[model samples]
Target: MEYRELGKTGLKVPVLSYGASSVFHSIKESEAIQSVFTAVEHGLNFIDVSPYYGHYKAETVLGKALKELPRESFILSTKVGKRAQESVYESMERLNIDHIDLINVHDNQVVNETLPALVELKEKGLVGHVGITDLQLENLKWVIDHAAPDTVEAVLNFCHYSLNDDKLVDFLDYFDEKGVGVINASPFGMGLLTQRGVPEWHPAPKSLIEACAKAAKFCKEQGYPIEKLAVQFSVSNPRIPTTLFSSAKSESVLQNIKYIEEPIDWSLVEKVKEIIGDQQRVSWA
Candidate 1:
């Protein structure tokens, strides 16, 4: 796996970081544990989780897996919204660890209420870094402007930088100028670009979904899975330091590693982009 610096944090994270959100609610506990081990074996040292994901189920399960490994083996990050201080302690308890490598203000909400507590934690050396996450650039912009530079070291933008959208790329220079690390999530557009396609809960317009379907079929005709295309397209860009991907099974994680190592046909990517056309930047809130 390729590794890169996460902004100026001095941490080298894998280009493909393990996302633990789906493991709790989507897969068996045994599978989740194996996935973590698979990730470590593959040199994917960065692991992302959240307290809200699976109602702390992901954290609890991830903690159980991490307990067996040495503390310095990986870079651990989790997000919190309300009760930032209490949530950190709760997350620490659940993870069976005392300090978190990074803590993001979940979804960029309650910044005024949460950031101070996180800043205090950072000062006390209980947290290594503090950041915020959101799908919308506006919310992230708000935090960038309102919070001090040291207080916000990273930001996670999901589904905004993918095969179907490229808006997150626009913020790379801005974030770089601020010395803030950027983590792009959901390279498959949160499952829209997968073979199974989008979910019923997806908020995208029908035309966009139809366009994505055509793109997926086009990739299939080229002997490529849409999932692989999406992952390759996401990692091809050098500006984004890290991209987060989730898989409930260890096999899927291994598959992703293989896909990213293979060469991607940029011409096919351009063709798919042409098919997407006007819906290229059409995003759902």
Candidate 2:
């Protein structure tokens, strides 16, 4: 797996880190653990899970997997927001650890309510780092302003990549200046850029899907695969150091990782730039 600076944190994270959304939330726990084992075996070293992703079950199951492996072999990152208050201690107990490598305020709603507690957690050495995360640009900015700087070392956004929603560039500059990590949650425009469509459950923008299909056809005519164009366009930006793309099937995960593993050729970059160009920013809103 290729590595990148996790936004000046000095920790080298795999470019294709494993996202545990589907492991417990969308699949059975046994399959989830197997998927995580597969990921680590294939060179992925960073694993991200959330307490609320599966009603606190995701982290619990992930913790089970971690227990089987050497603790120092992987960088485990989980969040403490949006989960039921009762689950906090329960999760910590289930994780079976006194400290978390990285912690973040999970969803937008939990940011304010969880901020104070996160500060206390950090001070107590239970959390090595903290950050704020939501899929919205507005909410991300709010977290940036409200959260404690040292604890909140990063900001998360999900919808900043739309052709119509070009908030990533400005936000990247802001994060760069603030010395905060910028973690992109959904870089495929919520699956619009994936060429077919998002899973029925994910609910992608139909307009963006149509636009992506149109662009895919254009790329096909030019001998560029739509998948390549999509992944390259999303990761091509200089400031986006890491992104989270989750999939249930092993084939899907491997495909996405392989595409990202190889650098995009400059010629193909220019082709995509001139072909899709501004359409790459097509958004649902």
Candidate 3:
């Protein structure tokens, strides 16, 4: 696994991180545990979980699997907000560890409570760094402005920003200038770029599948496959030092790793921009 600096922090993390957002609820505990172990064995070292997933079931499962690994082998991060605040200790106990490397104040869709208490937890040595994230720029900015510079270190902007959506880039530029690491989640555009095929009729709000078709065509005309182009496009940029991806099955995880290891060339970058056109992005508006 390739490692990168997470902003100005001394920590070095894997270029591709893992997210257990929808999995802890959808998959069985055995499957989830297997996935966690797979990720660790495959040279991936960063894992993020939240109590919100399956109402603490996800965290409990991840916590159990993580206990088997040495504390220094990998970095562990979890998001804490109102939903699991009462069960915070349970999460800590379940993970069988005392300190979390990073704790994000997550899912502040309409309101965020990651501040104040975030600082308190860090000061108490319960966590290494305190941070907050929402998928949008407004919410991200809100958290950054509210968080203390010394405490908060990273943030997430999901599918809202892309190669076309450069707003997040500007946000990332600001964050980068301030020495904060930016993590881009939903790097596949919420299943548009990575998924194998799409039905003629589906209920997704965006036009990503269509966009991806064009990207695939662009790749074929230009030499590489669309999947490689998409993954390369996601990782090539500097502002987003790390990208987060999640898969329901082990095969998908292995497939994603292929893109990570493949070569990213100039043609792929140009092709992605051509395919993306004037879309909005999280980092470079």
Q: Which predicted model would earn the best lDDT?
A: 1
lDDT of 3: 0.65
Clashes of each: 0, 4, 18
Q: Please give the range of 10 consecutive residues that has the lowest summed lDDT in model 3.
A: 276-285
Sort by lDDT, best first: what order?
A: 1, 3, 2
Using TM-score, rank the candidates from best to worst. 1, 3, 2
Clashes of 3: 18
Name the runs in model 2 displaced over 4 angstroms: 23-28, 51-59, 81-87, 108-113, 162-166, 200-207, 220-224, 273-282
TM-score of 3: 0.83
Q: Tens digits of per-residue lDDT for model 2 on 1-285? A: 667767766666666666754423445555656766777777777777663344555566667667888777777677654343334556667777666666766564444567767667667777666677776666777777766565467666676743324567777777787788776656566655556656676654555556566666776777766676566555666576666665555666667677777677677555544554455555444
1-285: candidate 3 lDDT, tens digit per residue: 677878876677777777754533546545656766777789777777753344555566667667888888888787665444444455677677888788776654322354556656777788777666775777777666665555558776776444434456667667866677877776666555543644445444355456666765666776676666566567667657677776556666677778787777776666677776644342311
- Candidate 1 vs 2: which has more lDDT: 1
lDDT for 242 in candidate 1 is 89
- Residue 244 error for model 1, in Å? 0.6
TM-score of 1: 0.92
Regions of candidate 3 where Cα sits further than 4 Å from its true position: 21-28, 51-56, 81-87, 107-113, 160-166, 195-209, 217-223, 279-285
lDDT of 2: 0.63
Candidate 2: which pairs clash? 162-281, 163-281, 163-282, 164-281
Q: What is the C-alpha lDDT of each candidate?
A: 0.82, 0.63, 0.65
